[PDB]
Scaffold this active site. Structure first.
Site, PDB file in Angstrom:
ATOM      1  N   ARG A   2       0.849  -1.194   0.000  1.00 26.50           N
ATOM      2  CA  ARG A   2       0.000   0.000   0.000  1.00 26.50           C
ATOM      3  C   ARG A   2       0.883   1.242   0.000  1.00 26.50           C
ATOM      4  NH1 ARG A   2      -2.129   1.608   4.420  1.00 26.50           N
ATOM      5  NH2 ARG A   2      -1.664  -0.263   5.653  1.00 26.50           N
ATOM      6  N   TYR A  26      -0.800  -4.614  -6.072  1.00 27.75           N
ATOM      7  CA  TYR A  26      -0.515  -5.133  -4.732  1.00 27.75           C
ATOM      8  C   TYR A  26      -1.587  -4.873  -3.674  1.00 27.75           C
ATOM      9  CZ  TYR A  26       2.500  -7.022  -1.049  1.00 27.75           C
ATOM     10  OH  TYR A  26       3.027  -7.802  -0.039  1.00 27.75           O
ATOM     11  N   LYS A  71      -9.227  -2.471   2.117  1.00 27.43           N
ATOM     12  CA  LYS A  71      -9.114  -1.219   2.879  1.00 27.43           C
ATOM     13  C   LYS A  71      -9.954  -0.118   2.235  1.00 27.43           C
ATOM     14  CE  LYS A  71      -6.007  -2.729   5.887  1.00 27.43           C
ATOM     15  NZ  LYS A  71      -6.324  -2.824   7.336  1.00 27.43           N
ATOM     16  N   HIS A  82     -11.097  -0.599  12.098  1.00 27.38           N
ATOM     17  CA  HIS A  82      -9.895  -1.412  11.923  1.00 27.38           C
ATOM     18  C   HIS A  82      -9.717  -2.303  13.156  1.00 27.38           C
ATOM     19  CE1 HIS A  82      -5.279  -1.484  10.956  1.00 27.38           C
ATOM     20  NE2 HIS A  82      -5.916  -2.463  10.338  1.00 27.38           N
ATOM     21  N   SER A 125      -0.084  -1.277  13.189  1.00 25.78           N
ATOM     22  CA  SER A 125       0.767  -2.277  12.549  1.00 25.78           C
ATOM     23  C   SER A 125       1.806  -2.860  13.500  1.00 25.78           C
ATOM     24  CB  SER A 125       1.461  -1.665  11.335  1.00 25.78           C
ATOM     25  OG  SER A 125       1.875  -0.337  11.604  1.00 25.78           O
ATOM     26  N   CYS A 150       1.588  -5.063  16.037  1.00 26.43           N
ATOM     27  CA  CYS A 150       1.256  -5.102  17.469  1.00 26.43           C
ATOM     28  C   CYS A 150       0.534  -6.380  17.911  1.00 26.43           C
ATOM     29  CB  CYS A 150       0.440  -3.867  17.870  1.00 26.43           C
ATOM     30  SG  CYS A 150       1.332  -2.313  17.733  1.00 26.43           S
ATOM     31  N   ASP A 176      -9.034  -8.345  11.183  1.00 25.93           N
ATOM     32  CA  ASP A 176      -8.678  -7.033  10.604  1.00 25.93           C
ATOM     33  C   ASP A 176      -9.777  -5.955  10.629  1.00 25.93           C
ATOM     34  OD1 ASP A 176      -6.551  -5.400   9.394  1.00 25.93           O
ATOM     35  OD2 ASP A 176      -7.676  -5.547   7.524  1.00 25.93           O
ATOM     36  N   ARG A 192       3.200 -11.550   2.182  1.00 28.20           N
ATOM     37  CA  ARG A 192       1.833 -11.862   2.595  1.00 28.20           C
ATOM     38  C   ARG A 192       1.426 -13.311   2.404  1.00 28.20           C
ATOM     39  NH1 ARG A 192      -0.986  -7.531   5.231  1.00 28.20           N
ATOM     40  NH2 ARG A 192       0.550  -5.840   4.968  1.00 28.20           N
TER      41      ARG A 192
HETATM   42  O1  3PP Z   1      -3.572  -3.270   2.551  1.00 25.52           O
HETATM   43  C1  3PP Z   1      -2.514  -3.937   2.544  1.00 25.52           C
HETATM   44  O2  3PP Z   1      -1.853  -4.182   1.502  1.00 25.52           O
HETATM   45  C2  3PP Z   1      -2.009  -4.456   3.871  1.00 25.52           C
HETATM   46  C3  3PP Z   1      -3.156  -4.899   4.782  1.00 25.52           C
HETATM   47  P1  3PP Z   1      -2.691  -4.693   6.526  1.00 25.52           P
HETATM   48  O3  3PP Z   1      -2.108  -3.297   6.637  1.00 25.52           O
HETATM   49  O4  3PP Z   1      -3.988  -4.893   7.277  1.00 25.52           O
HETATM   50  O5  3PP Z   1      -1.685  -5.786   6.793  1.00 25.52           O
HETATM   51 MN    MN Z   2      -5.069  -3.974   8.788  1.00 22.24          MN
END
Ligand code: 3PP
Ligand code: MN
Ligand code: MN
Ligand code: NA
Length: 613
Positions: A85, A233, A242, A262, A284, A286, A309, A403
């Site tokens: 992202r 990606y 998201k 979230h 992130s 945690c 998530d 991932r």
């Molecule tokens: O959106 C992404 O590419 C990562 C998802 P996360 O930030 O929940 O791991």
């Molecule tokens: Mn997330």
């Protein structure tokens, strides 16, 4: 209607029919076919056949590799320019900037990125016309949430990436039954392109189509549109993940009186058969997935995963806060996933899983930093960069943001109610972050308003840097964060609302030497037990300036060694004076004119309690 031959794309449909699509779906598909000029249109049915064939086709073209050690598992290695992202290319379009982000007092906004409608239209025109030439446009009908759910919302994603199709099948509920459920209803328009029309103008790297220079991930909440270009990606391309589930949804939630958050959702049962559902928002790194899939150490206790998530939550007529996981799978960070850290994740990803940017072992398995299990002598590693790798090497074998993408139904502890249309009743909401100093293991907010403030005040270690991430939503607000705060606070004025208890946790407090004071992992069930009892109105809490902490002896520490409870629960006036001062400055700058009265009041109150210790 046609004077010629070039608006009806019926002749180009290679699966499904334009004619059978609902009116508004056809218009979305066809209008964008006219713009992007795909060679073919494939209307996804979501079938196993469609899926297996698409995978084998990607395998043919060197887009993915099959992992022979596992059952139907696959590996994609990306262009290194396209690995995450990109927040700096992620935008929300509204008429007024203030509706999207508060206007900061001193510097630049960290709470979102607004783009004018005028600027977006120019950006769009510079990217999308002709962008799918020579490629198939896949039409993905998908539901965010259980198909029957009154909490669920439907999208249509158009994409020129088979990788996106495959991943969307896992991450959402997609296919023909979604189209049939939709009918003439409303849907979120999701448009994606890798931005590499054929013939390719630029070199294709690692068989991974992408356009980094033109990458743009846009949200137009007023038009119910997500438009994303240039990245293949994760969060940039899987538009349910998201873009829809947090950014668009938070705005819909604001309009409609609910919450898009979230948050993980878990169900916890005590040794007397009593079950409670809890939601938790962590930034992130945690241990979010770790908590959601926790194997509890305390005898007689059970933890079951609803989601890891995203949570969509709405109070019902009886005042219960009902939550669903709008996702259908887990898109987790691979490195650091081990038998010690997440044994339930290990069991999940053994089967039907797509891996991205991890290392591959010579026997067709997966590898990453922190996997914590040795390889038999002879087994060699190929890194995510398609080169021979050695434990002595300076570079990681897997990308830090690599991932796994795995079906939720495969989680051995997936909650029996994880797809119940009504959702699950939330009784506790947990905030938390990585704080090496000052912040106790667990505290409980003094009230709903103090609880909202606690969420607003969240900070986490990213020389290191501690940054703000209010509600773990910093990169995800669909609209003005001050208005988001006001939206949360308004929940207290809903008659009959059963407001959940709000807690804050810190698994990451260190002593003077840099060593974690809390063992964590499955031992976190001991903190969850305390929370459970507190929801039940148990007299197990001690008042402090920051909220309630556990009394002495209240926390079950049996089976642990000599845990340093003094340093773990210590609260320093000096530390909190500084803490409250920087929260004050942050909120004034970043939220400014849009900071609700009650948040300012909670801030004054905290300052005052600290001044008296
Ligand atoms: O959106 C992404 O590419 C990562 C998802 P996360 O930030 O929940 O791991
Ligand atoms: Mn997330
Ligand atoms: Mn109020
Ligand atoms: Na590749």
């Amino acid at each position: 209607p046609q004077l010629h031959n070039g608006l009806d794309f019926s002749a180009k449909v290679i699966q499904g029919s334009l004619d059978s699509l609902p009116q508004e779906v056809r218009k979305f598909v066809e209008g964008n076919a006219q713009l992007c000029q795909p060679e073919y249109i494939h209307i996804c049915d979501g079938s196993e056949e469609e899926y297996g064939r698409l995978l084998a086709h990607m395998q043919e073209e060197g887009v993915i590799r099959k992992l022979k050690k596992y059952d139907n598992c696959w590996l994609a290695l990306t262009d290194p320019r396209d690995v995450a992202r990109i927040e700096s290319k992620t935008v929300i379009i509204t008429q007024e900037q203030r509706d999207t982000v508060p206007i900061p007092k001193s510097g630049q906004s960290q709470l979102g990125r607004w783009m004018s409608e005028e600027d977006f239209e120019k950006a769009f025109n510079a990217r999308f016309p002709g962008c799918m030439k020579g490629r198939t446009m896949y039409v993905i009908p998908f539901s965010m949430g259980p198909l029957g759910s009154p909490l669920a919302k439907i999208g249509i994603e158009l994409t020129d990436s088979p990788y996106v199709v495959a991943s969307m099948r896992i991450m959402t509920r997609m296919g023909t039954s979604v189209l049939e459920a939709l009918g003439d209803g409303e849907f979120i328009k999701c448009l994606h392109s890798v931005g590499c029309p054929l013939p390719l103008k630029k070199p294709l790297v690692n068989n991974w189509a992408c356009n980094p220079e033109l990458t743009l991930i846009a949200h137009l909440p007023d038009r119910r549109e997500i438009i994303s270009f240039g990245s293949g990606y994760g969060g940039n391309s899987l538009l349910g993940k998201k873009c829809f589930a947090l950014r668009i949804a938070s705005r819909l939630a604001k309009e409609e009186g609910w919450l898009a958050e979230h948050m993980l959702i878990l169900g916890i049962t005590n040794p007397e058969g009593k079950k409670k559902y809890l939601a938790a928002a962590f930034p992130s790194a945690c241990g979010k997935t770790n908590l959601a899939m926790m194997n509890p150490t305390l005898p007689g206790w059970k933890v079951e995963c609803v989601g890891d998530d995203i949570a969509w939550m709405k109070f019902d007529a009886q005042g219960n806060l009902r939550a669903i996981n709008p996702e259908n799978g887990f898109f987790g960070v691979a490195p650091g996933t081990s038998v010690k850290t997440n044994p339930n994740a290990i069991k999940t990803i053994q089967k039907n899983t797509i891996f991205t940017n991890v290392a591959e072992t010579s026997d067709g398995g997966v590898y990453w930093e922190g996997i914590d299990e040795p390889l038999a002598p002879g087994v060699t590693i190929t890194s995510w960069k398609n080169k021979e790798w050695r434990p002595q090497d300076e570079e990681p074998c897997a990308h830090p943001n690599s991932r796994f993408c795995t079906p939720a139904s495969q989680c051995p502890i997936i909650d029996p109610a994880w797809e119940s249309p009504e959702g699950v009743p939330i009784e506790g909401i947990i905030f938390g972050g990585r704080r090496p100093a000052g912040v106790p293991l667990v505290y409980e907010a003094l009230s709903w308003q103090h609880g909202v403030f606690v969420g607003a005040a969240m900070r986490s270690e990213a020389g290191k840097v501690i940054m703000h991430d209010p509600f773990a939503m910093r990169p995800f607000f669909g609209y003005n964060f001050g208005k988001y705060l006001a939206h949360w606070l308004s929940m207290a004025h809903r008659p009959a609302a059963k407001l959940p208890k709000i807690f804050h946790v810190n698994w990451f407090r260190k002593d003077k030497n840099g060593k974690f004071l809390w063992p964590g992992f499955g031992e976190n069930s001991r903190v969850l037990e305390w929370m459970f009892g507190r929801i039940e109105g148990e007299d197990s809490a001690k008042l402090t300036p920051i909220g309630y902490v556990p009394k002495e002896d209240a926390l079950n520490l049996k089976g642990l060694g000599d845990v340093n409870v003094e340093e773990l629960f210590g609260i320093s006036k000096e530390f909190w004076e500084k803490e409250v001062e920087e929260i004050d400055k942050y909120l004034e700058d970043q939220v400014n004119a849009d900071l609700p009265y009650e948040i300012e009041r909670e801030l004054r109150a905290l300052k005052q309690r600290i001044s008296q210790m």
